[PDB]
Amino acid sequence: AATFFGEVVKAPCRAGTEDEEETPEDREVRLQLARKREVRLLRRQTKTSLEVSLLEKYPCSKFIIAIGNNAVAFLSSFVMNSGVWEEVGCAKLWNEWCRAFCVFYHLKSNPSVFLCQCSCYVAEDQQYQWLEKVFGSCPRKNMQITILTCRHVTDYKTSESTGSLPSPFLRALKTQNFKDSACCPLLEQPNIVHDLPAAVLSYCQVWKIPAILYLCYTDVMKLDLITVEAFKPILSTRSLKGLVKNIPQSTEILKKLMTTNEIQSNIYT
Amino acid sequence: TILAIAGEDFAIVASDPKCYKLTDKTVIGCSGFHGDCLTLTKIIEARLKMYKHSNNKAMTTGAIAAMLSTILYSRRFFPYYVYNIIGGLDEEGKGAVYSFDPVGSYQRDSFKAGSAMLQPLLDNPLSLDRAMRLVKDVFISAAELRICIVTKEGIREETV
Amino acid sequence: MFRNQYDNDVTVWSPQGRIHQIEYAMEAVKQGSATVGLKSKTHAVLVALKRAQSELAAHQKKILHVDNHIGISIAGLTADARLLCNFMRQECLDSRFVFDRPLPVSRLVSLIGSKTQIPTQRYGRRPYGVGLLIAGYDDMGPHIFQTCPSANYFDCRAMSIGARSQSARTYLERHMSEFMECNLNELVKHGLRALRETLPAEQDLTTKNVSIGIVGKDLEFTIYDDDDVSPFLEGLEER
Amino acid sequence: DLLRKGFSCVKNELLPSHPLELSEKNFQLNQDKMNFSTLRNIQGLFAPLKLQMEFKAVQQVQRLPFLSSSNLSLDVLRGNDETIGFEDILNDPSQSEVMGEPHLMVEYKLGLL
Amino acid sequence: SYDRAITVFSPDGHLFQVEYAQEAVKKGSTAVGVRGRDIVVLGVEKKSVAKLQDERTVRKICALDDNVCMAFAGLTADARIVINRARVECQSHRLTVEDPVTVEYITRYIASLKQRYTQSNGRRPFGISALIVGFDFDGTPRLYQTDPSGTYHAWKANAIGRGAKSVREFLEKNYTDEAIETDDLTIKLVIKALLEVVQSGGKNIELAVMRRDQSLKILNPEEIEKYVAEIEKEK
Amino acid sequence: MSRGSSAGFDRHITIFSPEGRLYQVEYAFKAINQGGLTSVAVRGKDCAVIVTQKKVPDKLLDSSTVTHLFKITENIGCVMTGMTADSRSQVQRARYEAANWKYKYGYEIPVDMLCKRIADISQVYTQNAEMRPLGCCMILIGIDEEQGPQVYKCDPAGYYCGFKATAAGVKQTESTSFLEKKVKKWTFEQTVETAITCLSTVLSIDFKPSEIEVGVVTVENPKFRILTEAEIDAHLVALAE
Amino acid sequence: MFLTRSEYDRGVNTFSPEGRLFQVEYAIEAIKLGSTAIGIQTSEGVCLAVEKRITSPLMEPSSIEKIVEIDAHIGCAMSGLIADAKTLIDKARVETQNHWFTYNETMTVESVTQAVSNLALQFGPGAMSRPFGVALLFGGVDEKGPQLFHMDPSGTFVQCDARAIGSASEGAQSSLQEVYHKSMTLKEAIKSSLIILKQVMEEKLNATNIELATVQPGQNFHMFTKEELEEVIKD
Amino acid sequence: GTGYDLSASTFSPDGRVFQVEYAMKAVENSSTAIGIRCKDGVVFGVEKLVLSKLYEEGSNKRLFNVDRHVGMAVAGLLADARSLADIAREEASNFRSNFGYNIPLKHLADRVAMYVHAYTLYSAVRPFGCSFMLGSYSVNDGAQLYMIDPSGVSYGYWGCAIGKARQAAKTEIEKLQMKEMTCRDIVKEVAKIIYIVHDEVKDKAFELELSWVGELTNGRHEIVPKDIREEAEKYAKESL
Amino acid sequence: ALASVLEGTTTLAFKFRHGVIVAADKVIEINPYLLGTMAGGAADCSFWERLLARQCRIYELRNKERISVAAASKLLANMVYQYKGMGLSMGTMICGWDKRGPGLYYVDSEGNRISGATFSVGSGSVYAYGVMDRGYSYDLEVEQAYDLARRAIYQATVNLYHVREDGWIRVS
């Protein structure tokens, strides 16, 4: 961080105490910036917006959340291939890293089953606004929450080198009220998870709601077949039992999706 | 002595001096000081390899002639002592022969030589057999041994 | 949690006695497609797996050309690969021009290692982020080498690098016994069979994402693409 | 170009006017080369490397090139702090009769021109 | 927190020090230029009077050659370097070519010089913006403008400095072919555009003019007052 | 360098403390004691003597390769205290400077001139932001043509002076007090005995012939010479009896 | 088990714990602030289309050159910062003239793209310390058929058949994949490109806010005029 | 020493440079190499861990040759060791060119040690992370062995051992009669020591690599013949 | 790593209201709009006119406008003047029609650069210059000018070109 010869530089701080502590124009610019980064819940199908929190206007018995492109692809291929689902609303965000973008559906046969698909990035100052908009302040007593997320294998902590692990693999973390069991070993001791899934799990734990979070550790973070297929053991759990009916159709849809992914960059060859 | 004759479908280059092959459709003939000739041939080979790597394509005859002219004129105040003749199949079936000077000015022609007037043999067209016979017979008629015919098939190694 | 101060520079030693930037650079080789190389008593071949961003694009070049008897395959960054290829071409051309004798592969690899070691010790630079497989033929017979971002080279005999190369490496280790007494057709067949292990068990090794480079005693370096790889592929069995 | 430079003859730049011109213009470089060669042949590679590193580090803290500098540490390291030559008393560079624009000389020092 | 280095990109792809230089330009003094049929007009608004000052030593309109002139707005010290560099370059090109310089050529040179100083962390950009008008060798009027980033464009009329949005809106509303026909009409248009933002005119306006093959001319307070009174008479 | 400078009143060599103290120089001074040995130099009427400790703790080492007495020139001897690599590098630099002075002026460099040149070189390291001071101190002895024996010393701060009897290492203060007590109240045999007795009294060791090494210069023989085991043992026996 | 802060994207020579030089990715992201450019090559010529996005009616339209002339048979496109593309186009033109002077031959499109890319891959005297924030799109005819290429801030080029660079790259590429055919003529390509442009742009597509150019195998580079744009849009 | 260990030109409050200490700690991340000097020669021995069966027999060699009379064994970072070997070759070749005869080992050790130490002074470079040994034999000088440290200090040794487990290796080396044995027994003793010090749980498998220079080789560095190596391995395994 | 840290020919030409006409008994085609004449060393003429042609092409590409005859002649004179006294030998006439009417210039190796209306160099060119001066005018006929050039060549004793507002053509 030295520009010329002999400049005095200070080492960075890992605790984030470098902001120190320290006019109406300042208030105006702060308010403008705050309004530029405000989470808003809208009903995409006509209308303009919404008034009351999403779960405070409907009854719920199961909630499934997907974060990342791989989990969204998994649920699209394996769960949404059958039945009819009606979109309820979408979320509008703005970060330095963003801009299915946080779109909510529910089963028509069972109006008490909800599914979410967030493929965007939510900054650390928009987690609690997202929680307030989606859940609210009067949580229901009887709910089930399943969360899916993908993380890079270099974030794992092991006695051996991280390149020796047989990736991909699954890990779990569940609330004390989760009377069921998991299909994968629980996360080890010196490992932590942050961001949106951590926020949802913390909310569920604090307000005494059963919940479970699944993590997939992969060496490739793009749309790859192996990463999506690594989620298969979840299909045998009681959480997703009456939602999966046809496997070969899901495999064919997955093949088509893997054919039509996206355009790529030209950095790595 | 260096003698080069063009043709309707092939280029005839002969010598008794040395003749070198640059590609499948070009033959270079040099004379004069040996060290300068060797250095010029090495430079030509190196730049030919560089162009082949850069453009992923072999050099044609006209491009070789232009590059050689630029190389020759690069050192004008300390000129070389060489005489170069380029002959080969240029683009699409026409024999092309190029003449040079020690300073680096070139022009295209049909008959060029390097041993005085070399029996020009007015009039005579000039098929491969007749041209080869005339080229062989000029030296023995003068009475004062290698032929490298270039064609679409390839380059031969005729000897006398 | 204590790594924050000791991993922003390549001229800083960690309290455990490690340099983390070298390992981070080594992590970049696994960002590219898998490539496979193997040799026999007479020939050395290189097999790569091309990858296109989408349907309306042409697959990028993974096998380059250095000299009449040396060819390489790349995996990792692209600018570093181009710079290294330029250096190798310049060295080979200079040696040929001066000594009128081809530059030996061992000397080339030693020069590459010596050049690559430098930016891992001084300030203002970063390690190269590309791994190479070099195949050549000289007076000592066929050769095959590997290059690491940590300025290390190994004189292997059958190696594969890139993303998800463990299966190919296992297959090569299993079948390395019967490689010396083979000719070109079954050598290329073994290479393709080893490379096929990388793909998931739903795809196929079609004639649109395969590049082959072959060098030998009387045969110069040659690259086959598109319809040129058809004669090398009909004999393969099913999965 | 053609106004920032002029009155230059190519044929009058290849041939030096006096036998002593080049030797006087490049005395320090030749002296350093001789000293470094002798030191490297006697002791090893490390001594010239250390000397060059010290010279480079010292020479990097000076005034901008449109103002005269003193060069004290460099003279201490070289040993010219107790010797006076003809370069010190003749044609004093602190009272030069010509000088260019500041920004242009600073840019030329960096090599952007 | 990505705005403390010149050559550092933002996560959304922004270079912020150049934008801060543009912000520094934004707080200068208004300068307006209009390109006419057979004339070009420039004009700036004066700051605090400072009655005990010599007005000759402070001017914001300069002549680069016999057919090019320039106005600026931003930092005062930085413009004095670019002006001298352009003045030297004009004569250098005259030696090189024997033809008088082109407005586009001199604008491109100035833009390149400005761009050179936004490529390293050891130097800071020039916080000025320029308006260049002149006549080509074919007798065609021109008008250009540069930015601290190093980009230039060709305009019919525009304005820079503080309070430029209202001036540009007025110019857009009131610029046409019926008010450009005569030199007097063009000068009245420029004066009105300047009056749209300045206080009581006639004492806070500096205006210049250049016709074809006539060199730069600086209008005097008597003529400025005459034009202002003529405008005032027109309801 | 592009590494910048650390922030703090210590932690950099070109930063002044609120009352003008350079702390990196004092830390370099503290670095001398890292070796753990002590050196003593005493100047006699017509001779100079250098005595230093020797410590080999490993039976797998070669005792002939462990030494701290160097020979800068045929008439100049040195003893180094501090880091071993730094001491050897500074010895090489001193040899180069002596050769350069000989070439430039035509006669052998004097001890004071050599010490002054070394100190002048060392002073530059404390003003720039690139180099760091060496953690060692050098003691030089020699015979002058017209002045006699001479003892000098240099320190990492760039300060040099001439003494009558000095010491360096870890017991410098006690050795200095003993030397003042002795001087306030000398042939060749008395100087060696005085130095050995000073070291033995300060360290409370009762040395054996294989734990010390001695180098002397005299007017009759002005060449630096390292004493041998037999001579050291003879001196120790004479001192004991 | 604590959570802390780590930074890996404030320097060009810093590797993230998974490779991933982030400054290059940020430079690539900086392309999205430009204007959409569409280029597709066919059996009888290559087409290039790009929007202008004029900021004010007072600006002269014939000054925002989003399509330039590298040589008599090679085009180019624009996306990102304007100042950098100028110093890349200058290199392209100088190289393509030097090749002719040396060999009496026309440079290959691939060769000129490689020569251009050899300059933008080196960073970190006159070389910059940051990646170029621009993406180019070459095209033209040669001894082979029509050819189309691409280039991004990382400095590496790839041959292609249908590209879309700018703000609406994703949607434009999706539409191009849906519509493109192996062998069409220079009317369906034009119609599809104009339709996609009119869809992606928020404003109405008139005859002045866009720009078009073609390179047929027989003729040299030719740029459509206002009447040609009007008659194409009307159809 | 936190706060004073980010550069090689910074002193701790107690007067010590910590980057050098980290560099010397980095050498215990590799395997163990030992060297024993005997009555009429010097014998080397290293423990090499096999990474895979694909590498050719003779890859990642850790026993180099400087010239026809000097051996070398390394430990630590491999690239730094290769660079130092190249520097040593250059120094020896230059000395031979100038003076016309073989370079003594002490001067070569001094030159290489000073070159290594030169990287300890500046903040623009990084200290080396490898330590090595040298050995030779002459009729009028006998056996000679030396050590080099990442800090830049050199010494002469009778028996030396560097790497992960230098302490135990030295412990078993000290109970030997170096001065009254030939190479024939020293090779077996070295093999036994290497087999004793090796740990089986952490490292999967390893292959030996032995060499000597001495009188019976006419002062030339060479690889042990295969039969002698096999019998030494058998002796070590039987004794273990 | 540490070491890396440190570092027999007759020609004539004339112009009038309807362009420029050049005649000879070689002539280099610099550009579709600029035409040149060779006199002296062949290699020097070829190389230097090729360099001028490429530089004019670069200028036209940069400025999106054709160069002027005066600028091209001045550029060629400046480029030649640098290597003065080195043995270069050339005499050239630059003819073209850009703006303000046609222009004709002469430039040689020494450094001369003269703008005139009639030019003729080489061997017995004095008779040609005399006859053309006798038959010179400003308002004439194209066929009359061709006949005058032919008569001048015949008296001096064929290559003939004409430069118009949109390029040059060869008639014989």
Swiss-Prot record, chain B:
Highest rank taxon of the organism: Eukaryota
N6-acetyllysine modified-residue sites: K136
GO biological process, alphabetically ordered: proteasome-mediated ubiquitin-dependent protein catabolic process; proteolysis involved in protein catabolic process
Subcellular location: Cytoplasm; Nucleus
Keywords: Acetylation, Cytoplasm, Deafness, Glycoprotein, Host-virus interaction, Intellectual disability, Nucleus, Phosphoprotein, Proteasome
Phosphoserine: residues carrying this PTM: S110
Glycosylation-annotated residues: S141
Record's signal peptide: none
Positions of post-translational Phosphotyrosine modification: Y98
Annotated disulfide bonds: none
One Gene Ontology cellular component: secretory granule lumen
Function comment: Non-catalytic component of the 20S core proteasome complex involved in the proteolytic degradation of most intracellular proteins. This complex plays numerous essential roles within the cell by associating with different regulatory particles. Associated with two 19S regulatory particles, forms the 26S proteasome and thus participates in the ATP-dependent degradation of ubiquitinated proteins.
Protein family according to the UniProt entry: Belongs to the peptidase T1B family.
Related illness: Neurodevelopmental disorder with microcephaly, hypotonia, and absent language: An autosomal recessive disorder characterized by microcephaly, intellectual disability with absent speech, severe developmental delay, short stature, and hypotonia. Affected individuals also manifest aggressive behavior and have hearing loss.
Protein name: Proteasome subunit beta type-1
Organism name: Homo sapiens
Swiss-Prot record, chain D:
Location, primary (coarse class): cytoplasm
Covalent cross-link Glycyl lysine isopeptide (Lys-Gly) (interchain with G-Cter in SUMO2), where: K11
Superkingdom of origin: Eukaryota
Motif (High-affinity association with the preproteasome): 40-44
Protein location: Cytoplasm, Cytosol; Nucleus; Microsome membrane
Swiss-Prot/TrEMBL keywords: Chaperone, Cytoplasm, Endoplasmic reticulum, Ichthyosis, Isopeptide bond, Membrane, Microsome, Nucleus, Palmoplantar keratoderma, Ubl conjugation
Tissue: Strongly expressed from the basal layer to the granular layer of healthy epidermis, whereas in KLICK patients there is a gradual decrease of expression toward the granular layer.
Induction record: By IFNG/IFN-gamma.
BP GO terms, sorted: proteasome assembly
GO cellular component labels: cytoplasm; cytosol; endoplasmic reticulum; membrane; nuclear speck; nucleus
UniProt function note: Molecular chaperone essential for the assembly of standard proteasomes and immunoproteasomes. Degraded after completion of proteasome maturation. Mediates the association of 20S preproteasome with the endoplasmic reticulum.
Subunit structure as annotated in this protein's UniProt entry: Constituent of preproteasomes, but not of mature 20S proteasomes. Within the preproteasome, may directly interact with PSMB1/beta6, PSMB4/beta7, PSMB5/beta5, PSMB6/beta1 and PSMB9/beta1i. Interaction with PSMB8/beta5i has been observed in PubMed:10973495, but not in PubMed:10926487. Forms tetramers.
Family statement: Belongs to the POMP/UMP1 family.
Protein name: Proteasome maturation protein
Species this protein is from: Homo sapiens
Gene this chain is encoded by: POMP
From Swiss-Prot, chain G:
Post-translational modification Phosphoserine, affected residues: S16, S56, S63
Coiled-coil zones: none
Induction statement: Up-regulated in colon cancer cell lines. Up-regulated in fetal Down syndrome (DS) brain (at protein level). May be the target of the transcriptional activator NFE2L2.
Entry-linked InterPro entries: Ntn_hydrolases_N, Proteasome_alpha, Proteasome_alpha-type, Proteasome_alpha_type_5, Proteasome_asu_N, Proteasome_sua/b
Keyword set includes Transmembrane helix: no
Residues bearing attached sugar chains per UniProt: S193
UniProt keyword terms in alphabetical order: Acetylation, Cytoplasm, Glycoprotein, Nucleus, Phosphoprotein, Proteasome
Pfam families per the UniProt record, alphabetical: Proteasome (PF00227), Proteasome_A_N (PF10584)
Single GO cellular component term: ficolin-1-rich granule lumen
GO biological processes: proteasome-mediated ubiquitin-dependent protein catabolic process
Modified-residue entries (N-acetylmethionine), positions: M1
Record PTM Phosphothreonine, positions in chain: T55
Assembly, per entry: The 26S proteasome consists of a 20S proteasome core and two 19S regulatory subunits. The 20S proteasome core is a barrel-shaped complex made of 28 subunits that are arranged in four stacked rings. The two outer rings are each formed by seven alpha subunits, and the two inner rings are formed by seven beta subunits. The proteolytic activity is exerted by three beta-subunits PSMB5, PSMB6 and PSMB7. PSMA5 interacts directly with the PSMG1-PSMG2 heterodimer which promotes 20S proteasome assembly.
Assigned protein family: Belongs to the peptidase T1A family.
Protein name from the UniProt record: Proteasome subunit alpha type-5
Upper taxonomic lineage: Eukaryota, Metazoa, Chordata, Craniata, Vertebrata
Name of the gene encoding the protein in the UniProt record: PSMA5
Curated annotation (Swiss-Prot), chain I:
Effect the entry attributes to changing A42V: Displays high resistance to the bortezomib, a proteasome inhibitor of the chymotrypsin-like activity
A GO molecular function held by the record: peptidase activity
Active site (catalytic residues): T9 (nucleophile)
PROSITE patterns: PROTEASOME_BETA_1, PROTEASOME_BETA_2
Gene Ontology CC annotation, any one: extracellular exosome
Its biological purpose: Component of the 20S core proteasome complex involved in the proteolytic degradation of most intracellular proteins. This complex plays numerous essential roles within the cell by associating with different regulatory particles. Associated with two 19S regulatory particles, forms the 26S proteasome and thus participates in the ATP-dependent degradation of ubiquitinated proteins.
Designated name of the protein: Proteasome subunit beta type-5
Organism of provenance: Homo sapiens (Human)
Gene: PSMB5
